Amino acid sequence: RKYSTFYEQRATLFEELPVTSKDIIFLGNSITNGCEWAELFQNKNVKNRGISGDICMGVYDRLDPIVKGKPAKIFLLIGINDVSRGTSADKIISEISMIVRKIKQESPKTKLYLQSVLPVNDCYGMFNGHTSRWQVVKQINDLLEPLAVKEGVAYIDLYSHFVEKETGKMNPVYTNDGLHLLGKGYLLWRDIVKPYVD
Amino acid sequence: RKYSTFYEQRATLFEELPVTSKDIIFLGNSITNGCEWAELFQNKNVKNRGISGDICMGVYDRLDPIVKGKPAKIFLLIGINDVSRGTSADKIISEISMIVRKIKQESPKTKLYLQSVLPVNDCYGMFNGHTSRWQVVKQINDLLEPLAVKEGVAYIDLYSHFVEKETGKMNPVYTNDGLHLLGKGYLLWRDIVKPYVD
């Protein structure tokens, strides 16, 4: 109920806001939703198309008001809420490939950047549906990078910078719940992807 | 737990993003948080300082990284989550006046715009703590406008445009849950406040 009403609130607002060929789109779930992307990059062309709670088919169904504008770049980060529903990495990758093919077909000039699913951590005892499945994150990214080269789009490895090598979980310094990012976490993200924005 | 962790996520990100003297700040709770304000006004200087779930003392405690930058304008809309906690309109107005005095003292050049609390509607059966108290919204705005003239700041009447005269509740066309706004609801909001932004 809460996800579906909030999804409709954001999606109908996105239909009222025009995308143009100069735009850089950050597309994803709550981890994308939570940032002021245009402020983070001091770039009037960076736009937030994140929706808290979103899943792969959720993004796919709302692509039209985005690809219609033929944006310059799209940065996609999606999948963790499908994990928390018990969906397998195989099925998640096939849904992500559906998203990739649609964007290429409807806006072939758009540069698409596939971002690694971020690690999670169960240390704070929250989002147990998500954090209890922290092993699935690597399974997804192991398939996601080959999908990127197979489809001729870019793969960006955020995972390696956020993960704790010794544990495979997200470094607690970047989060206060095991899933979402503190301000410092978005600063690190900015440092990794800034070259692809300019 | 969810509000407090999300509050910290947004507040720490706001501490990393500089405010400047040219900035227009939209400050409030989920109804402010939910919009892409810079896109809505096609104005690179409009910035989103909304936090879903926020309350009056919540805004007050995070004023420093905002007033420090001495922004040009601040649009404040806050109070409905205090209503849902059972707090009286008297106490809410005294907490809003605390917020007004702090901004005037720390950034006396900032123009402050106090926006009427929006009406709610119980017709969809959600946010019952909020929507069952729909009468308190008018009690707040009846005190809020005198507070604005007494303190020498502006009062903006959004309420009159969103309310259903015959019921006193929000017109269902603008919402799908009785509390938050659909895309059309933000378009109306844009039409009312656009003169104060340019």
PDB file of all heavy atoms in Angstrom, chain A residues 131-153:
ATOM      1  N   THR A 131      18.949  -7.527   4.328  1.00  0.00           N
ATOM      2  CA  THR A 131      20.311  -7.717   4.819  1.00  0.00           C
ATOM      3  C   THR A 131      20.631  -9.179   5.086  1.00  0.00           C
ATOM      4  O   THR A 131      21.805  -9.567   5.054  1.00  0.00           O
ATOM      5  CB  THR A 131      20.540  -6.896   6.087  1.00  0.00           C
ATOM      6  OG1 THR A 131      19.546  -7.233   7.065  1.00  0.00           O
ATOM      7  CG2 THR A 131      20.454  -5.415   5.781  1.00  0.00           C
ATOM      8  N   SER A 132      19.619 -10.006   5.350  1.00  0.00           N
ATOM      9  CA  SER A 132      19.883 -11.427   5.527  1.00  0.00           C
ATOM     10  C   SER A 132      20.322 -12.104   4.235  1.00  0.00           C
ATOM     11  O   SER A 132      20.802 -13.242   4.282  1.00  0.00           O
ATOM     12  CB  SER A 132      18.647 -12.132   6.078  1.00  0.00           C
ATOM     13  OG  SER A 132      17.642 -12.229   5.084  1.00  0.00           O
ATOM     14  N   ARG A 133      20.181 -11.434   3.094  1.00  0.00           N
ATOM     15  CA  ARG A 133      20.523 -12.001   1.798  1.00  0.00           C
ATOM     16  C   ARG A 133      21.740 -11.320   1.186  1.00  0.00           C
ATOM     17  O   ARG A 133      21.869 -11.244  -0.038  1.00  0.00           O
ATOM     18  CB  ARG A 133      19.330 -11.910   0.854  1.00  0.00           C
ATOM     19  CG  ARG A 133      18.141 -12.719   1.312  1.00  0.00           C
ATOM     20  CD  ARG A 133      17.035 -12.592   0.304  1.00  0.00           C
ATOM     21  NE  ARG A 133      15.958 -13.547   0.534  1.00  0.00           N
ATOM     22  CZ  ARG A 133      14.870 -13.301   1.259  1.00  0.00           C
ATOM     23  NH1 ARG A 133      14.702 -12.119   1.844  1.00  0.00           N
ATOM     24  NH2 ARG A 133      13.944 -14.244   1.395  1.00  0.00           N
ATOM     25  N   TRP A 134      22.647 -10.836   2.032  1.00  0.00           N
ATOM     26  CA  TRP A 134      23.791 -10.069   1.560  1.00  0.00           C
ATOM     27  C   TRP A 134      24.659 -10.833   0.560  1.00  0.00           C
ATOM     28  O   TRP A 134      25.393 -10.200  -0.207  1.00  0.00           O
ATOM     29  CB  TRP A 134      24.627  -9.628   2.760  1.00  0.00           C
ATOM     30  CG  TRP A 134      25.122 -10.788   3.554  1.00  0.00           C
ATOM     31  CD1 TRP A 134      24.446 -11.465   4.527  1.00  0.00           C
ATOM     32  CD2 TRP A 134      26.397 -11.423   3.434  1.00  0.00           C
ATOM     33  NE1 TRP A 134      25.228 -12.480   5.027  1.00  0.00           N
ATOM     34  CE2 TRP A 134      26.430 -12.475   4.371  1.00  0.00           C
ATOM     35  CE3 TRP A 134      27.514 -11.206   2.624  1.00  0.00           C
ATOM     36  CZ2 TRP A 134      27.537 -13.305   4.522  1.00  0.00           C
ATOM     37  CZ3 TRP A 134      28.616 -12.033   2.776  1.00  0.00           C
ATOM     38  CH2 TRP A 134      28.618 -13.069   3.716  1.00  0.00           C
ATOM     39  N   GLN A 135      24.596 -12.171   0.541  1.00  0.00           N
ATOM     40  CA  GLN A 135      25.409 -12.930  -0.408  1.00  0.00           C
ATOM     41  C   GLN A 135      24.912 -12.761  -1.836  1.00  0.00           C
ATOM     42  O   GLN A 135      25.699 -12.886  -2.781  1.00  0.00           O
ATOM     43  CB  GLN A 135      25.424 -14.424  -0.058  1.00  0.00           C
ATOM     44  CG  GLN A 135      25.585 -14.761   1.416  1.00  0.00           C
ATOM     45  CD  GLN A 135      24.264 -14.679   2.181  1.00  0.00           C
ATOM     46  OE1 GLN A 135      23.204 -14.431   1.596  1.00  0.00           O
ATOM     47  NE2 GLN A 135      24.327 -14.886   3.493  1.00  0.00           N
ATOM     48  N   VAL A 136      23.616 -12.483  -2.015  1.00  0.00           N
ATOM     49  CA  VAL A 136      23.035 -12.408  -3.353  1.00  0.00           C
ATOM     50  C   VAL A 136      23.538 -11.192  -4.122  1.00  0.00           C
ATOM     51  O   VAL A 136      23.498 -11.177  -5.361  1.00  0.00           O
ATOM     52  CB  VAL A 136      21.499 -12.415  -3.243  1.00  0.00           C
ATOM     53  CG1 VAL A 136      20.847 -12.402  -4.620  1.00  0.00           C
ATOM     54  CG2 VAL A 136      21.049 -13.632  -2.451  1.00  0.00           C
ATOM     55  N   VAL A 137      24.041 -10.179  -3.415  1.00  0.00           N
ATOM     56  CA  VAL A 137      24.513  -8.962  -4.072  1.00  0.00           C
ATOM     57  C   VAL A 137      25.656  -9.279  -5.025  1.00  0.00           C
ATOM     58  O   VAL A 137      25.657  -8.848  -6.184  1.00  0.00           O
ATOM     59  CB  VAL A 137      24.920  -7.913  -3.019  1.00  0.00           C
ATOM     60  CG1 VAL A 137      25.620  -6.728  -3.681  1.00  0.00           C
ATOM     61  CG2 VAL A 137      23.686  -7.457  -2.242  1.00  0.00           C
ATOM     62  N   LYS A 138      26.636 -10.059  -4.557  1.00  0.00           N
ATOM     63  CA  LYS A 138      27.754 -10.425  -5.420  1.00  0.00           C
ATOM     64  C   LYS A 138      27.302 -11.326  -6.569  1.00  0.00           C
ATOM     65  O   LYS A 138      27.752 -11.155  -7.709  1.00  0.00           O
ATOM     66  CB  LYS A 138      28.858 -11.091  -4.596  1.00  0.00           C
ATOM     67  CG  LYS A 138      29.962 -11.684  -5.450  1.00  0.00           C
ATOM     68  CD  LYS A 138      31.255 -11.827  -4.684  1.00  0.00           C
ATOM     69  CE  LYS A 138      32.413 -11.290  -5.517  1.00  0.00           C
ATOM     70  NZ  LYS A 138      32.576 -12.017  -6.814  1.00  0.00           N
ATOM     71  N   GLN A 139      26.397 -12.274  -6.303  1.00  0.00           N
ATOM     72  CA  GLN A 139      25.877 -13.108  -7.386  1.00  0.00           C
ATOM     73  C   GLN A 139      25.284 -12.255  -8.501  1.00  0.00           C
ATOM     74  O   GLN A 139      25.441 -12.571  -9.687  1.00  0.00           O
ATOM     75  CB  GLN A 139      24.818 -14.078  -6.866  1.00  0.00           C
ATOM     76  CG  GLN A 139      25.183 -14.844  -5.622  1.00  0.00           C
ATOM     77  CD  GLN A 139      24.040 -15.729  -5.152  1.00  0.00           C
ATOM     78  OE1 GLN A 139      23.023 -15.869  -5.841  1.00  0.00           O
ATOM     79  NE2 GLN A 139      24.197 -16.327  -3.972  1.00  0.00           N
ATOM     80  N   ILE A 140      24.590 -11.173  -8.139  1.00  0.00           N
ATOM     81  CA  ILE A 140      24.004 -10.294  -9.147  1.00  0.00           C
ATOM     82  C   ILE A 140      25.097  -9.578  -9.932  1.00  0.00           C
ATOM     83  O   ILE A 140      25.073  -9.539 -11.167  1.00  0.00           O
ATOM     84  CB  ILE A 140      23.035  -9.292  -8.491  1.00  0.00           C
ATOM     85  CG1 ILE A 140      21.785 -10.007  -7.991  1.00  0.00           C
ATOM     86  CG2 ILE A 140      22.652  -8.184  -9.471  1.00  0.00           C
ATOM     87  CD1 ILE A 140      20.813  -9.080  -7.297  1.00  0.00           C
ATOM     88  N   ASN A 141      26.074  -9.000  -9.228  1.00  0.00           N
ATOM     89  CA  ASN A 141      27.096  -8.217  -9.915  1.00  0.00           C
ATOM     90  C   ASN A 141      28.010  -9.089 -10.764  1.00  0.00           C
ATOM     91  O   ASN A 141      28.523  -8.624 -11.786  1.00  0.00           O
ATOM     92  CB  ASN A 141      27.897  -7.413  -8.903  1.00  0.00           C
ATOM     93  CG  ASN A 141      27.050  -6.367  -8.202  1.00  0.00           C
ATOM     94  OD1 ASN A 141      26.141  -5.780  -8.795  1.00  0.00           O
ATOM     95  ND2 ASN A 141      27.339  -6.134  -6.934  1.00  0.00           N
ATOM     96  N   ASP A 142      28.203 -10.354 -10.376  1.00  0.00           N
ATOM     97  CA  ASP A 142      28.963 -11.284 -11.208  1.00  0.00           C
ATOM     98  C   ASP A 142      28.281 -11.532 -12.551  1.00  0.00           C
ATOM     99  O   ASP A 142      28.963 -11.757 -13.555  1.00  0.00           O
ATOM    100  CB  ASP A 142      29.171 -12.608 -10.467  1.00  0.00           C
ATOM    101  CG  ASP A 142      30.222 -12.512  -9.363  1.00  0.00           C
ATOM    102  OD1 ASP A 142      30.931 -11.483  -9.297  1.00  0.00           O
ATOM    103  OD2 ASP A 142      30.338 -13.470  -8.561  1.00  0.00           O
ATOM    104  N   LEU A 143      26.945 -11.514 -12.592  1.00  0.00           N
ATOM    105  CA  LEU A 143      26.229 -11.622 -13.860  1.00  0.00           C
ATOM    106  C   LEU A 143      26.033 -10.276 -14.534  1.00  0.00           C
ATOM    107  O   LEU A 143      25.922 -10.213 -15.763  1.00  0.00           O
ATOM    108  CB  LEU A 143      24.857 -12.269 -13.653  1.00  0.00           C
ATOM    109  CG  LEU A 143      24.795 -13.617 -12.941  1.00  0.00           C
ATOM    110  CD1 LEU A 143      23.353 -14.054 -12.803  1.00  0.00           C
ATOM    111  CD2 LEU A 143      25.590 -14.650 -13.702  1.00  0.00           C
ATOM    112  N   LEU A 144      26.000  -9.198 -13.751  1.00  0.00           N
ATOM    113  CA  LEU A 144      25.641  -7.890 -14.287  1.00  0.00           C
ATOM    114  C   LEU A 144      26.738  -7.328 -15.178  1.00  0.00           C
ATOM    115  O   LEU A 144      26.453  -6.763 -16.242  1.00  0.00           O
ATOM    116  CB  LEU A 144      25.344  -6.940 -13.135  1.00  0.00           C
ATOM    117  CG  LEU A 144      24.710  -5.592 -13.427  1.00  0.00           C
ATOM    118  CD1 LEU A 144      23.348  -5.750 -14.095  1.00  0.00           C
ATOM    119  CD2 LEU A 144      24.590  -4.869 -12.093  1.00  0.00           C
ATOM    120  N   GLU A 145      27.997  -7.456 -14.757  1.00  0.00           N
ATOM    121  CA  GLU A 145      29.101  -6.950 -15.572  1.00  0.00           C
ATOM    122  C   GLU A 145      29.201  -7.656 -16.921  1.00  0.00           C
ATOM    123  O   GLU A 145      29.344  -6.963 -17.948  1.00  0.00           O
ATOM    124  CB  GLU A 145      30.407  -7.041 -14.772  1.00  0.00           C
ATOM    125  CG  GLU A 145      31.637  -6.608 -15.550  1.00  0.00           C
ATOM    126  CD  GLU A 145      32.865  -6.466 -14.666  1.00  0.00           C
ATOM    127  OE1 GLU A 145      32.945  -7.167 -13.633  1.00  0.00           O
ATOM    128  OE2 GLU A 145      33.744  -5.640 -15.001  1.00  0.00           O
ATOM    129  N   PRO A 146      29.128  -8.994 -17.007  1.00  0.00           N
ATOM    130  CA  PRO A 146      29.047  -9.633 -18.336  1.00  0.00           C
ATOM    131  C   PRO A 146      27.862  -9.163 -19.164  1.00  0.00           C
ATOM    132  O   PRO A 146      27.993  -9.001 -20.383  1.00  0.00           O
ATOM    133  CB  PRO A 146      28.931 -11.128 -18.002  1.00  0.00           C
ATOM    134  CG  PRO A 146      29.536 -11.269 -16.655  1.00  0.00           C
ATOM    135  CD  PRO A 146      29.235  -9.992 -15.927  1.00  0.00           C
ATOM    136  N   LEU A 147      26.698  -8.958 -18.542  1.00  0.00           N
ATOM    137  CA  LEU A 147      25.555  -8.427 -19.279  1.00  0.00           C
ATOM    138  C   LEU A 147      25.880  -7.070 -19.887  1.00  0.00           C
ATOM    139  O   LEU A 147      25.465  -6.769 -21.014  1.00  0.00           O
ATOM    140  CB  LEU A 147      24.338  -8.332 -18.357  1.00  0.00           C
ATOM    141  CG  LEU A 147      23.050  -7.672 -18.866  1.00  0.00           C
ATOM    142  CD1 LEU A 147      22.630  -8.228 -20.214  1.00  0.00           C
ATOM    143  CD2 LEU A 147      21.942  -7.880 -17.855  1.00  0.00           C
ATOM    144  N   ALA A 148      26.641  -6.245 -19.162  1.00  0.00           N
ATOM    145  CA  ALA A 148      26.975  -4.913 -19.652  1.00  0.00           C
ATOM    146  C   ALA A 148      27.837  -4.989 -20.904  1.00  0.00           C
ATOM    147  O   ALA A 148      27.605  -4.256 -21.873  1.00  0.00           O
ATOM    148  CB  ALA A 148      27.683  -4.109 -18.561  1.00  0.00           C
ATOM    149  N   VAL A 149      28.846  -5.867 -20.903  1.00  0.00           N
ATOM    150  CA  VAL A 149      29.707  -5.973 -22.079  1.00  0.00           C
ATOM    151  C   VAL A 149      28.953  -6.644 -23.218  1.00  0.00           C
ATOM    152  O   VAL A 149      29.077  -6.241 -24.379  1.00  0.00           O
ATOM    153  CB  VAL A 149      31.029  -6.700 -21.743  1.00  0.00           C
ATOM    154  CG1 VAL A 149      31.560  -6.251 -20.392  1.00  0.00           C
ATOM    155  CG2 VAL A 149      30.890  -8.218 -21.792  1.00  0.00           C
ATOM    156  N   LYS A 150      28.123  -7.642 -22.898  1.00  0.00           N
ATOM    157  CA  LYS A 150      27.337  -8.314 -23.925  1.00  0.00           C
ATOM    158  C   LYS A 150      26.386  -7.349 -24.622  1.00  0.00           C
ATOM    159  O   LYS A 150      26.149  -7.478 -25.827  1.00  0.00           O
ATOM    160  CB  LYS A 150      26.569  -9.487 -23.310  1.00  0.00           C
ATOM    161  CG  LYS A 150      25.695 -10.266 -24.290  1.00  0.00           C
ATOM    162  CD  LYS A 150      26.498 -10.746 -25.512  1.00  0.00           C
ATOM    163  CE  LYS A 150      27.491 -11.866 -25.177  1.00  0.00           C
ATOM    164  NZ  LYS A 150      26.844 -13.213 -25.089  1.00  0.00           N
ATOM    165  N   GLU A 151      25.851  -6.366 -23.901  1.00  0.00           N
ATOM    166  CA  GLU A 151      24.929  -5.409 -24.498  1.00  0.00           C
ATOM    167  C   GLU A 151      25.603  -4.120 -24.938  1.00  0.00           C
ATOM    168  O   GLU A 151      24.946  -3.275 -25.554  1.00  0.00           O
ATOM    169  CB  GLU A 151      23.792  -5.075 -23.523  1.00  0.00           C
ATOM    170  CG  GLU A 151      22.834  -6.224 -23.262  1.00  0.00           C
ATOM    171  CD  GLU A 151      21.899  -6.492 -24.431  1.00  0.00           C
ATOM    172  OE1 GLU A 151      21.892  -5.690 -25.392  1.00  0.00           O
ATOM    173  OE2 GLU A 151      21.168  -7.505 -24.384  1.00  0.00           O
ATOM    174  N   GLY A 152      26.883  -3.943 -24.637  1.00  0.00           N
ATOM    175  CA  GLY A 152      27.574  -2.757 -25.094  1.00  0.00           C
ATOM    176  C   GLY A 152      27.254  -1.510 -24.314  1.00  0.00           C
ATOM    177  O   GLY A 152      27.260  -0.416 -24.885  1.00  0.00           O
ATOM    178  N   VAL A 153      26.958  -1.644 -23.021  1.00  0.00           N
ATOM    179  CA  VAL A 153      26.775  -0.509 -22.127  1.00  0.00           C
ATOM    180  C   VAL A 153      27.854  -0.584 -21.050  1.00  0.00           C
ATOM    181  O   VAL A 153      28.565  -1.582 -20.918  1.00  0.00           O
ATOM    182  CB  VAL A 153      25.366  -0.470 -21.498  1.00  0.00           C
ATOM    183  CG1 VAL A 153      24.290  -0.420 -22.579  1.00  0.00           C
ATOM    184  CG2 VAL A 153      25.153  -1.670 -20.608  1.00  0.00           C
TER     185      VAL A 153
END
